[PDB]
Amino acid sequence: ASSRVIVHVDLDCFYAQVEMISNPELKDKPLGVQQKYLVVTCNYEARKLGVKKLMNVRDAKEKCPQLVLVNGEDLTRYREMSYKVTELLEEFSPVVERLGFDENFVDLTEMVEKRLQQLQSDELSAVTVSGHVYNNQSINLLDVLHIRLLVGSQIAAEMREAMYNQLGLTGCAGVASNKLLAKLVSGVFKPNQQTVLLPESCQHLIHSLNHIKEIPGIGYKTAKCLEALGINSVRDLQTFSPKILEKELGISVAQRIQKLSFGEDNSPVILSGPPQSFSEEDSFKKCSSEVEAKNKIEELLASLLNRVCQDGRKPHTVRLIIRRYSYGRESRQCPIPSHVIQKDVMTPMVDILMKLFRNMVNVLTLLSVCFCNLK
Amino acid sequence: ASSRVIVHVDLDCFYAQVEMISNPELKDKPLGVQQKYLVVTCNYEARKLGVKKLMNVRDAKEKCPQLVLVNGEDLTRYREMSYKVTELLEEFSPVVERLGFDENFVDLTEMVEKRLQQLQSDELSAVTVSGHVYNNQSINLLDVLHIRLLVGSQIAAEMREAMYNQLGLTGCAGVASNKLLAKLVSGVFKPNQQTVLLPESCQHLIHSLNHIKEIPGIGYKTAKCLEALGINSVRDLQTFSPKILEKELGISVAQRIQKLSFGEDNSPVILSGPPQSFSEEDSFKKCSSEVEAKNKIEELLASLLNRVCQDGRKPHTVRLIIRRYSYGRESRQCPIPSHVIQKDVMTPMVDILMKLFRNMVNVLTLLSVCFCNLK
DNA sequence: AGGACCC
DNA sequence: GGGGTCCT
DNA sequence: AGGACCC
DNA sequence: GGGGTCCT
Ligand SMILES: Nc1ccn([C@H]2C[C@H](O)[C@@H](COP(=O)(O)OP(=O)(O)OP(=O)(O)O)O2)c(=O)n1
Ligand SMILES: Nc1ccn([C@H]2C[C@H](O)[C@@H](COP(=O)(O)OP(=O)(O)OP(=O)(O)O)O2)c(=O)n1
Ligand code: NA
Ligand code: NA
Ligand code: NA
Ligand code: NA
Ligand code: NA
Ligand code: NA
Ligand code: NA
Ligand code: NA
């Protein structure tokens, strides 16, 4: 009757798990993936040693200091295994929303309902859960809603088995009645495990968070904005005057995060499909030097156009983005001339981006190109 | 081989022509439609007396000063006859782009081609033009392109006959090979006439303009921006250094208006379909007075919601817009809560718009509401 | 959210 | 004036 | 064009 | 870090 069953799939240590598949010799050698001076992520064969995501190399390294590092500044292989996952999930139900390269929501409502359509009266008593149940809560085989959530978790365990048999990947699921809760209950047991949340334990999940910043939807800026007003817990946010919430953020944000704080989230799962933009990015110590920076720009374009091509679609807008020292980024944008779309192409393309460059740079700590408006 | 046939349909004195249909007694009584202190438009039974569009009432009136005026601040009847026109044109070819309440582009390419598909070798010599030919230019019955443009104008004359037999409306057409030129050649003979432009007279059309501001695409601001640099004629704009054009407007605008200045326009005719927004607007002497201005806002909402309803679709964003004395307008915007979409509705709606109001008004010459993001 | 354009 | 469209 | 969010 | 999404 309008209650949903959503699954939130979230792969373990994604990048490190691609590097290990490519290079067995890194199988339980404690592994971190390197981008610039950061350990962007590391394997659980390494996490125990107090090595954390986005930890300094020097820090990550003093700990360990044989832990092993691979460069992961080129995201090609990760983007490619990432879409294989969504594609796999799409085979179950077509409505798959990506969050990042490693998270997916699937709306399982239509599938739970078909399955249960499909059972005799007896085989209805023997419906079992698969994996964890949040807060060790008792199942009631007569609660139409518990019955679905368990069938949910049966699907999830199938999605997980398949991600492993078909892509050699392990990870987590959370089943629950909306995206917020599903995203939250997928982390309870890590790393290669899954959890289902029964409606009666919703407040327990929600109140188990220590910081409002842990709510998907509330950011760094938002949080410190609430902290300023004296709102630190989920309950502070629950009990707090709508009128005061409006006087800081707008009725847009104010009414939405308050729902979030109660565990209430109506957003549907959206079909991501193909991406709305391809971009490429380079970051540095400084730069400033028109001509190489034309280089740096040349580099991004060569790689970008390869990617954009295969897709099949074509993009009708280019973007240039920069950063100074000293964020705090600045962008210029323009359409991509008709005849230029047909495809030669780099030559005329660089001219573009380079005027675009001059419109904000006279007399730089990052450069990046984006193609968007894909048709 | 990739050359198009576009028709640009543009109704005479649109509003005044709706008022005359509703009220015969205004048939050749020299008629102007009034909005506030302006004559927004007047009939040709009145234009000869040097009465012009957007002329003061006092001015429009000293001239004439029995000319007759009707209020046209409520655009309901005009919007309704307007869509009947597009709908009529849609019956010919489905791809109709609106410009305003009174202009339409139809791409006739597929239809000219079918018709000519459809003629015997003889009946190909007897293909005649219908209406004017721009610059009295000779037709060459062996130029595949003249042949189409004439078939174009045969369609246009049918569209016009039909607008008159079916809606009692008269107006103009221009046929030509792109939107820019079609829009330009439709005005050559006014008011109830049509013109076709053969490719050989394109420069004659283009150079017959006196100000660049007369090019559809070049505005008030743009123009005075070029005037500043010493570019006043179409040819000044033609011959003028791409590099200098970029240093004022961007490679976006710079490369596009230069094409325009040569008569070159690749933009396809786009299917407008249903509108992307409904708005309502009120303008005044001053205001300032929270409570009535809640009135003024109440008014717009009552009318807006009526309109929005019938459509069938529903809007997921509301907008509030204001203006000060003293443009120079200021807007706030927010989504329209899920449960509120279902539809009661004014009550919760006003609260919205009124906070939105306070976010820019402390301690006003126009107020208006917009619903957009229609799904 | 503002801003360029078009009627 | 009283509306619209797209782009940034 | 910038800005909030997410990985 | 190196990417993404939507909204204003
Ligand atoms: N700010 C961020 C956040 C994440 N990632 C990357 C690194 C991870 O490999 C990956 C996917 O996101 P997760 O947050 O799920 O991080 P992990 O998958 O690495 O870890 P885990 O499941 O162990 O928590 O994308 C990144 O580069 N920069
Ligand atoms: N700034 C403007 C421009 C136009 N209109 C209105 C008045 C006209 O009735 C109509 C349609 O546009 P046109 O520019 O074609 O103007 P007309 O149809 O009035 O006149 P005409 O064909 O005689 O030139 O919309 C308006 O209200 N405000
Ligand atoms: Na399957
Ligand atoms: Na968060
Ligand atoms: Na989220
Ligand atoms: Na017809
Ligand atoms: Na113009
Ligand atoms: Na135009
Ligand atoms: Na468009
Ligand atoms: Na969306």
Instruction: Dig out the tokens for A67 from the structure.
Output: 């832990």
Residues B131 and B254 in one domain: no
Q: Which of B250, B334, B338 sits opposite A334 (nearest CB)?
A: B250
- For residues B272 and A355, the answer to whether their CB atoms sit within 8 Å is no
3-state secondary structure of A317: strand
**3-state SS assignment for residue B63:** coil
3-state secondary structure of A200: helix
Instruction: Return the exposure string of A25-42: e unless at least 16 CB atoms fall within 10 Å of the residue's CB, then b.
Output: ebeeebbbbbbeebbbbb
Q: Are residues B185 and B104 in the same domain?
A: yes
Q: How far is A65 from chain B (nearest CA, A)?
A: 51
B92 is written with which tokens? Answer: 């010919």
Q: Which structure tokens are listed for B229?
A: 């640099």
A255/B338 CB distance under 8 A: no
Beta carbons of A108 and A5 less than 8 angstroms apart: yes
Give the integer Cα–Cα distance in Å for B80 and B167: 12
Q: Is A319 helix (H, G, I), strand (E, B) or coil?
A: strand
Q: Is A103 a catalytic residue?
A: yes
The answer to whether residues B30 and B68 touch, using CB atoms and an 8 Å cutoff, is yes
What residue ranges line ligand 2, CB within 6 angstroms? B 10-15, 40-41, 100-102
C-alpha distances (whole Å) from B365 to each of B72, B252, B325, B352 are 20, 34, 6, 21
Last residue of a domain, one of B167, B197, B227: B197
Written as one string, the DSSP assignment of A255-295 is HHHHHHHTT---PPP----S-S-EEEEEE-S----HHHHHH
* CA B232/CA B229 separation, integer angstroms: 9
Nearest to B337 among A246, A255, A359 (CB): A255
d(CA A123, CA A68): 51
- Its domain, for residue A215, covers 198-274
B18: left (phi over 0), alpha (psi -120 to 50) or beta: alpha
User: Are B89 and B34 members of one domain?
Assistant: no
Is residue B360 within 8 Å of residue B331, measured between CB atoms? no
Q: State, as a whole number of angstroms, the distance between the CA of B322 and the C1' of C1.
A: 13
Domain stops at, among A253, A274, A295: A274
Indicate the helix (H) or strand (E) that contains B371.
strand B366-374
**Alpha carbon of B255 to those of B250, B260, B340: distances in Å?**
8, 9, 45
HEC string for B256-274: HHHHHHCCCCCCCCCCCCC
A352 touches chain B (CB under 8 A): yes
- Asked, as a colleague might, if the bond just before A32 is cis with ω within 30 of 0, I would say no
Based on the fold, state whether residues B54 and B119 are members of the same structural domain.
no
Burial A184-211 (b: 16+ CB within 10 A, else e): bbbebeeeebbbbbbeebbeebbeeeee
CB contact under 8 A, A334 and B266: no
Enumerate the residues of chain B whose CB falls inside 8 A of the CB of residue A337: 255
What the block records as the tokens of B372 is: 């957009």
Helix (H) or strand (E) run with residue B232 in it: none
- Measured CA to CA, the distance from residue A25 to residue A63 in angstroms comes to 22
Cα B134 to Cα B353: distance, rounded to the nearest angstrom = 52
Rounded (5°) CA angle A38-A44-A49: 70
Same domain, B131 and B224: no
CA proximity to B169, closest of B89, B70, B269: B89
One-letter amino acid at A229 equals: L
Q: With an 8 Å Cβ cutoff, are B251 and A338 in contact? A: no
Q: Which residues pair with A366 in a beta bridge?
A: A283, A323
Helices (H), chain B: 14-22, 44-47, 57-62, 76-92, 109-116, 144-167, 179-186, 202-208, 220-229, 234-238, 242-249, 251-261, 290-311, 338-341, 346-358
Give, in order, the Cα–Cα distances in Å from B263 to each of A177, A339, B229: 59, 17, 22
Place of tokens 């008269």: B170
Radius of gyration (C-alpha) of chain B in whole angstroms? 24
Mark whether A262 and A280 lie in a shared domain. no
Reduce the DSSP state of residue A315 to 3 states and report it.
strand
d(CA A168, CA A221) in angstroms, rounded, equals 38
Nearest to A254 by CA among A237, A272, A270: A237
Looking at residue B208, which CATH number applies to its domain? 1.10.150.20
Q: Which of residues 219-278 of B touch A (CB under 8 A)?
A: 246, 250-252, 255, 266
Q: Are residues B247 and B291 in the same domain?
A: no
Type and span of the H or E element at A358 = helix A346-358
Distance from CA(A316) to C1'(E3), angstroms, rounded: 23
Distance in Å, residue B329 CA to nucleotide C2 C1'? 9
Residue B373 Cα to ligand 10 middle (Å): 10
Proximity of residue B79 CB to strand D below 7 A: yes
Measured by CA distance, the residue closest to atom 20 of ligand 2 is B13
Cβ atoms of A365 and A287 closer than 8 Å: yes
Indicate the residue among A274, A292, A325 that finishes a domain.
Answer: A274
DSSP conformation letters of B73-103: ---HHHHHHHHHHHHHHHHH-S-EEEETTTE
A102 CB under 6 A from ligand 1? yes
Instruction: Give the resolution value in Å.
Output: 2.5
Per-position b or e across A261-294, b if 16+ CB within 10 A of its CB: bebebeeebeebeeeeebebeeeeeebeeeeebe
Phi, psi of B194 (to 5 degrees): -140, 155
> In Å, how far are B82, B217, B222, B232 from B214, measured between CA atoms?
24, 9, 11, 11
Q: Are residues B228 and B241 in the same domain?
A: yes
Whether A151 and A112 have beta carbons less than 8 Å apart is answered as: yes
Could you say which of A246, A255, A355 has the minimum Cβ distance to residue B251?
A355
Q: How far is CA A168 from CA A18, A22, A98, A348, B69, in A?
A: 9, 11, 20, 43, 79
Q: How far is B267 from chain A (nearest CA, A)?
A: 10
Looking up tokens 């005005």, which residue turns up?
B187
The sign one gets for the Cα dihedral A30, A31, A34, A38 is negative
What are B339's two structure tokens? 């449960």
Q: Is B320 exposed, middle or buried (0-12, 13-18, 19+ CB in 10 A)?
A: buried
Whole-Å CA distances, A250 to A134, B145, B353 = 34, 58, 12
Same domain, B85 and B159: yes
CA distance B332 to B137: 54
Burial group, residue A21, by CB count within 10 angstroms (0-12, 13-18, 19+):
middle
Q: Is the dihedral of CA A242, A243, A248, A249 positive or negative?
A: positive
- CATH number of residue A285's parent domain: 3.30.1490.100
Helix (H) or strand (E) holding A229: helix A220-229
Ligand 1: nearest atom to the Cα of A33: 9
What CA–CA distance (Å, rounded) separates B13 from B52?
Answer: 11
Q: CA-to-CA distance for B118 and A324, rounded, in angstroms?
A: 65
Query: What is the domain count for chain A?
Result: 4
Q: How far is B247 from chain A (nearest CA, A)?
A: 9
Same domain, B104 and B43: no
A262 and A298 both lie in a single domain: no
CATH number at residue A186: 3.30.70.270
Phi and psi at residue B174, in whole multiples of 5°? Answer: -130, 130
Residue A128 and residue A89 share a domain: yes
Residues contacting strand E at CB < 7 A?
A: A 99-103, 183, 215-223, 328-333
